[PDB]
Amino acid sequence: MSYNYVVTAQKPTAVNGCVTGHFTSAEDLNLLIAKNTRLEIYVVTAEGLRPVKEVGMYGKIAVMELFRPKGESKDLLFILTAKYNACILEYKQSGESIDIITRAHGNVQDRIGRPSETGIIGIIDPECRMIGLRLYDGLFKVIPLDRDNKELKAFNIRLEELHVIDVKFLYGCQAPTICFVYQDPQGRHVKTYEVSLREKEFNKGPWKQENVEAEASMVIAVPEPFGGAIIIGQESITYHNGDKYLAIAPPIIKQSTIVCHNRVDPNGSRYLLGDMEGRLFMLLLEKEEQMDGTVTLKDLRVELLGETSIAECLTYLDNGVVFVGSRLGDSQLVKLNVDSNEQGSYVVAMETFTNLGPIVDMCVVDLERQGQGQLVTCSGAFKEGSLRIIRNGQKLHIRTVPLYESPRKICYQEVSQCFGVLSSRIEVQDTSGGTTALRPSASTQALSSSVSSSKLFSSSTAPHETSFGEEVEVHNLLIIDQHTFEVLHAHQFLQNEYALSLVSCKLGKDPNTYFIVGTAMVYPEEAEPKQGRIVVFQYSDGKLQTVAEKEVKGAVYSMVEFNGKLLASINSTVRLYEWTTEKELRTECNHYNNIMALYLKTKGDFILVGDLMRSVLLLAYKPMEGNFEEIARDFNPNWMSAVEILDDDNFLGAENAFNLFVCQKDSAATTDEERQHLQEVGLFHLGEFVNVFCHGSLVMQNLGETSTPTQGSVLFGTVNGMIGLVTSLSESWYNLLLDMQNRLNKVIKSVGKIEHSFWRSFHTERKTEPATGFIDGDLIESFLDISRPKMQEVVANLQYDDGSGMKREATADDLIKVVEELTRIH
Amino acid sequence: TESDWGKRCVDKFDIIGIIGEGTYGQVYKAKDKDTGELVALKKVRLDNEKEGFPITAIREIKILRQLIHRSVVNMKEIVTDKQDALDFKKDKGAFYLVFEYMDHDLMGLLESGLVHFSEDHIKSFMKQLMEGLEYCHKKNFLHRDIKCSNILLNNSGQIKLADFGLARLYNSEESRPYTNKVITLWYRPPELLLGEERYTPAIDVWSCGCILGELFTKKPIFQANLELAQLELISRLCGSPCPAVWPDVIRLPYFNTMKPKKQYRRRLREEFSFIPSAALDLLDHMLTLDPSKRCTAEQTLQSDFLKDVELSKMAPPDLPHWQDCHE
Amino acid sequence: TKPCWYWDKKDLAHTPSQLEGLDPATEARYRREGARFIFDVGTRLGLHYDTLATGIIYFHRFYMFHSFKQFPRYVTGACCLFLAGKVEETPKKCKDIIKTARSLLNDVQFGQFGDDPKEEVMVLERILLQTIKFDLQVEHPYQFLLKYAKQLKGDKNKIQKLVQMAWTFVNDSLCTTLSLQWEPEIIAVAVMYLAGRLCKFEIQEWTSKPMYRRWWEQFVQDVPVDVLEDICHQILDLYSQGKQQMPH
Ligand SMILES: O=C(CSc1nc2ccccc2[nH]1)Nc1ccc(Cl)cn1
Structure with a gap:
């Protein structure tokens, strides 16, 4: 058996949801921010947010909503975890003592059901009569909010529409009514039902079905003054309410997908909309009052306010202040002004809350020779793309290097006092036939620059048509100084070439230190790439020189230096190359019992391969023979996201189900089969998605620091910004x-x-x-x-x-x- | 000739790796040196000298050389280790069962969850499995070990049945005492939980229904660790075993011994409301408690869900691609 | 695809046993003894008739590829029965076959099993499987005797007498190389034909084609009387050579 210890070094920073209400007191205005497994409670002031309380939950927060049932003085909090743990929570304060009350709780998982594509959806009735849950295709679950339902018992109503996109409870209905967009073979539709707690079924809904945009994404519940709903798409915004129908299709929104919505004016006059490029819009409901005294919706208008971070959640607080909850970049408080500034913007940033963003890759390096070690992470995506240098000093000190393009892989090259960073930026097909970048970014703001002129795939004769407006990725290798963190050089890879792997090393008897990048030719037509390059660069005197290139028949997903040789994984093959005296790569040995070799790690003459679905494989290089041998494989099937070698017998892996496992050689040679079987001896749920395992520790070492009982140090980075440490025990x-x-x-x-x-x-x-x-x-x-x-x-x-x-x-x-x-x- | 099995040496195959550990030995993927065809070699070890050649392998050799079907795996030949020269008593070299290499297995594809089955994909998949089962049942052979892991699937979309290690002939006229526990608990029929010991081909049908449901939910329907616990889960969905639905349930050894908590009513149609109507009927019939009232393989093929499925269009599933690898 | 398991009578002059100086009578005697040993051992163990026959067919086939002077028959017989039990799903432990083999064999005969009887047998399993080319499924005259008899309609007692007499002839043909000359379907017809002649029954009357004097042609296509007579002659020879007479 194996024994290990996992600790959280930096808590999840990405904002997964945010709501406002009156949770701590019927008087205060609260902002509840949800990070993976973490709930943060704030109180809104005139300057910003006053923190009051933070709790952890033993689960990923999937649904977070505030409601106030008749008889309560203040809002109650509903939370549902991703493992289907439901509870109702209350804030209670006794002087200086703050605690969180569990008023009702239970697990709402069904024995049989198909998890839906658009994920768990949770909504609550405007009269707080029931909680609606969409957990499985073809089913709607109702938790009625009666005083006696302390166990949150619930029933399912059969739903004919199997593929639901989004659902909300509507305002202004005689009975609890749901409005939702669904998809069937004829396109997307909007439809209504009424929910009867007495009959425990659906009844015919208040208004008829309407066919809606094919990419209709979100349902907005309009308040009582107007009633009805708004449907947000890729090109159009529409309003539906019985006989009333409006549609505005302003060209500005077609440019970027809108992902988040919030209400500014409680009466529904003004809503906020955000898009994937970071733009913040105001949606205006223009009112028309008839002599009847009734109020109708006259028209819809969309007005561009400015730019925020790409936001998972928006919530308007008060006055001009909006909280921008970002998962891909830093979250924010921004103020909306009535008058635009001289650039035309109405949005001005107030505060910036650090979000380590998605940590795609990272390396631990001792920059100052401190022996403490600093962690440089590839963080963020698109505009929020950044390099983050993290050191311990009691809080962590974090420096941010803005890139404005997506960072992919990072590796440190000490000989050159710089880092190599793989990156990609989005350009769009333009009228010239080429492409234009939406904004300048690291790869375009380099001091010196270069473009591959490789002729390897130039024979082509394979047609790939381009339509104006389509997005493309442009991948680059960045050379970045270790002290200034200034982009010294940017190398742009071939058209439709994606950079997947990066190493810095010496090979063979060659004294030069090289940057080596593994790439893949990516065409939309191919499910798996069939072409690729391994490229050897030298960074010398401010310029990057192409030293050698090797053509491979696939995608170079991962590379790692192996005792002066280059170990690379090309699709199903793991291949070892030797570096000749002619400065060219030479194939030595291959391995092919791999579905897709995604991750590679080496210790000595041993190699660990992570397959997309075949768990981990322990390989060994046999120098006497010049080939590979399969030592032992984990037959239990798991999807791999990242792997790491702990010691010669223990191996660590990360599952795409946010789970962690450790396999060990059976070390009993009775039968050859026992050794060739890796037994999973460690299983842990963790709750985060691991992208990068990296040996190292950030603790200051003076060589005198008492040696802790825990032995070894593996740091891991995750999609939500959480950084953890894995170590072994006796x-x-x-x-x-x-x-x-x-x-x-x-x-x-x-x-x-x-x-x-x-x-x-x-x-x-x-x-x-x-x-x-x-x-x-x-x-x-x-x-x-x-x-x-x-x-x-x-x-x-x-x-x-x-x-x-x-x-x-x-x-x-x-x-x-x-x-x-x-x-x-x- | 092609028919002289057991003499050709395993030298003729260049082994690629190990694809799994079986029952009588490990199975290693390999390439034929002469043709290049990929094969998977199952290793049979007689060195144990406990009872000699494993009967499990003997069953697979006897049955699969008789069975010819698109949806049943092909044993291409049997090869051997370099035998000791003119000394059979010293010889302890193993034998190998060469089979065709099928690219993936259903349990592995479902476990990653990467694959996304449509109704049409399931139709093609289920139709092949049932056609293969029908061929075998018509030849009066019972699989007795129907599992997701024993269903092999090429990227092309062709399906093949695989582990005939526990397969035996069924005689309708002469009831024969068999082995009570054969199918894995997750897919085991209820009759065998109560220990019929004299079971019909309908035991395989029950499993394939559990697979049918599994394809729709992306989850095995009845997952338990104890025989009584499985009966409870089955009983909650399919209804408690009772004399009205299973007239002969009283004759089963453990009927009084093994009882569900309650006499649960059947809820299959309700809990599977999301499944299409044509398929839901197939499930209700395939997951029928009484083996005598449970549908046959032919009846499944002559169902609205499967009858009009055309095998010309195999419907290759959404097999995980490179973008599928990307986050 | 599948191997050929049938030879011509003329070919039996050239078995390994013959070419190592064994005369035809001795190999014939050696086959009867080995077959009957297999039959007697398995009967004592309670084995199904198919299991006995399967072992005997393995046995007969084996000595088409090997010599009796290098492979003791009784060890081979025991090995065939051991494998037959696993093939036909009537398994027995090797120690039990040895136990029974010792009970029935004298001291000289059991000397073939050497110092370690179980080992000599278990070791032979390797050669047997390679020799019979892993073609383990075998069909026997018994199933055809019954399949064909079921299609006869008439005097219940005359047909049952035909079947049992024919059934006895099948058991007796296992001591001969007929298993190596003719498919089982032909054997089943031949024994029906023989019993019909002996009981003075006219089987065509019991068929669906009562005016089809060659009654067997509806069961087994392309069989000349030449073949059925050759088989009958060979079966009755066993009775004439021995002291035993036709069952009647
Ligand atoms: O099992 C397969 C290929 S899928 C696979 N490759 C692996 C490699 C390593 C680990 C698990 C694997 N799973 N083929 C197959 C199955 C039965 C027969 Cl008889 C012949 N071939």
């Missing part, structure tokens, strides 16, 4: 910390009353297993924050083993010291 230390977890879980009160053991259970759509071989470091570290009565309750009857003393019951002070040492690993 059997004795694991058993102790594990026994302590079970004691802590009985003591610590969970938000939503979610069992910790369930949260960490390895979980796929198909399987659920109890965690094994992993210690939740964050649970262990919370021991220091629980009250003294609870600490002593935890240590009761807790004895030591396999130590200097074989049985030695610890005290609350003994454990405080142990955990405090464990907090010094990050």
